[PDB]
């Protein structure tokens, strides 16, 4: 498998920007915290500290230079995370600093559900990838709450030991979920029982800000120790650590598509890794007019070549990038 490790590590050598937009306004903070595509990857949504969710038509963005969103929604506090349903093209959820989880129609702006149980800031929301009704959220109240689109109140809750910074359902099971916690660990659960974690992953020295599923068998986490860690569902200690980027303070975003991992950096750059090798594959440096990349998302076009992704930085600058 050594040969493939090199072929996949040398697959890309350059990056070509296809579009540039701004999340912003009175020189106020315009940090982008979340980027996500809809099921078909026709549209992507952007959210951050301006309290606004902006939806853009992808094909419109990469054609011309002048970028007005398809639709715009407003929250009453900073937005920490967004997630599109994998079942309903228009269903979109947001989490914000009031603790609120809202279910939106991304094109009408109508709210179908307003979940107000988290007693503190909600950091993360994710739709179940194999159950159309279920989604999850995590908050500084040290709780992971499970919601059902057909019910007003949460159907279940996990009581963590510290702040919950990120939640994510498995892409291979409707009953598997992982979340990153301020106890410096990734926790892996089976919602059927919650006494009672399946596994607690130890290694990080600081709070786990992001945790994504590279697959049903591998998790990648990020913490503010300038370290990404690759885990296997079954081993309690990490398989590998990725180094090259600078992440000692801020949430720099994390995204995985297949075998490749992307994360921001506090040198106003994006870093790309191959999950089987610790060394940086390539880097993209944002221009500037102490800034950091704050969000990244793969355009995971099903049945295709995931050669493009979108990243944003603390200045509100957004770039669609093609891996050449």
Curated annotation (Swiss-Prot):
Locations listed in the record: Nucleus speckle; Cytoplasm
Keyword Lyase in record: no
Record-level Gene Ontology MF annotations: ubiquitin protein ligase activity; ubiquitin-protein transferase activity; zinc ion binding
One of the GO BP terms on file: protein ubiquitination
WD repeat residues: 27-65, 74-114, 117-157, 159-199, 203-241, 244-283, 290-322
Keywords of the record: Coiled coil, Cytoplasm, Metal-binding, Nucleus, Repeat, Transferase, Ubl conjugation, Ubl conjugation pathway, WD repeat, Zinc, Zinc-finger
Entry's family note: Belongs to the COP1 family.
Designated name of the protein: E3 ubiquitin-protein ligase COP1
């Amino acid at each position: 498998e050594f040969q493939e490790c090199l072929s996949k590590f040398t697959r890309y050598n350059s990056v070509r920007p296809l579009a540039t937009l701004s999340y912003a306004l009175y020189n106020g903070s315009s940090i982008v915290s979340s980027i996500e595509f809809d099921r078909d990857c026709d549209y992507f949504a952007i959210a951050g500290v301006t309290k606004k969710i902006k939806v853009y038509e992808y094909d419109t963005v990469i054609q011309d230079a002048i970028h007005y969103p398809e639709n715009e929604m407003t929250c009453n506090s900073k937005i920490s995370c967004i997630s599109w349903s994998s079942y309903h093209k228009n269903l979109l959820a947001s989490s914000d600093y009031e603790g609120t989880v809202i279910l939106w129609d991304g094109f009408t702006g109508q709210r179908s559900k307003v979940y107000q149980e988290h007693e503190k800031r909600c950091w993360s929301v994710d739709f179940n990838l194999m159950d159309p009704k279920l989604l999850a959220s995590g908050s500084d109240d040290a709780k992971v709450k499970l919601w059902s689109t057909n019910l007003d109140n949460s159907v279940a809750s996990i009581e963590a030991k510290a702040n919950v910074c990120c939640v994510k359902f498995s892409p291979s099971s409707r009953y598997h979920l992982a979340f990153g916690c301020a106890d410096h660990c990734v926790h892996y659960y089976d919602l059927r029982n919650t006494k009672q974690p399946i596994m607690v992953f130890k290694g990080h020295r600081k709070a786990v800000s992001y945790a994504k599923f590279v697959s049903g068998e591998e998790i990648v986490s990020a913490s503010t120790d300038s370290q990404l860690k690759l885990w296997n569902v079954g081993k309690p200690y990490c398989l590998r650590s990725f180094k090259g980027h600078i992440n000692e303070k801020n949430f720099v975003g994390l995204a995985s598509n297949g075998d490749y991992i992307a994360c921001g950096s506090e040198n106003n750059s994006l870093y790309l890794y191959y999950k089987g090798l610790s060394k940086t594959l390539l880097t993209f440096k944002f221009d500037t007019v102490n800034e950091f990349v704050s969000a990244v998302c793969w355009r995971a076009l099903p049945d295709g070549e995931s050669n493009v992704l979108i990243a944003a930085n603390s200045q509100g600058t957004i770039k669609v990038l093609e891996l050449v």
